[PDB]
């Protein structure tokens, strides 16, 4: 479905940014996507996610396997879904006002396979 949105929007599946969150099962890969502060190693490169937006802001940002990562990666996306703002390691804001954020998991898959029958969509 995410590749279907990318194909609808951009005439291509991989004209997008997929960042699979199973790679980020530790905490500190927050610094992989938002960058590193002044002083430290990868300062002059930027975060991957912020630069990948900063080229082509009208895009689709995909997060997959969201149950794999540590729970406190998701202060970054608190900023993101509050204002579309994100501040990389050099300290400039990156506008996410033209982005779509999709997060997938398999949380209640036992419960969904158990009770999708004989139940409404709502409850």
């Amino acid at each position: 479905l995410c590749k279907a949105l990318a194909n609808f929007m951009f005439d291509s599946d991989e004209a997008m940014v997929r960042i699979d969150m199973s790679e980020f099962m530790e905490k500190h890969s927050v610094s992989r996507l938002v960058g590193a502060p002044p002083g430290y190693v990868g300062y002059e490169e930027g975060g991957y996610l912020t630069e990948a937006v900063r080229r082509r802001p009208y895009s689709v940002i995909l997060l997959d396997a969201v149950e794999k990562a540590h729970p406190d990666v998701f202060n970054i996306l608190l900023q993101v879904l509050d204002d579309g703002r994100l501040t990389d390691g050099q300290g400039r804001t990156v506008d996410f006002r033209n982005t779509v954020v999709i997060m997938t998991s398999n949380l209640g898959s036992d419960l969904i396979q158990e009770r999708f029958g004989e139940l409404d969509y709502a409850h």
Binding site: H28, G39, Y40, V41, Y43
Partner: peptide, 24 residues
């Protein structure tokens, strides 16, 4: 009767930059 002109003689220097590292 020429006089040797004193020059301007533009120069050059450089500067490195360290990088610390966390150690997890």
């Amino acid at each position: 009767a020429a006089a040797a002109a004193a020059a301007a003689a533009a120069a050059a220097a450089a500067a490195a930059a360290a990088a610390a590292a966390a150690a997890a």
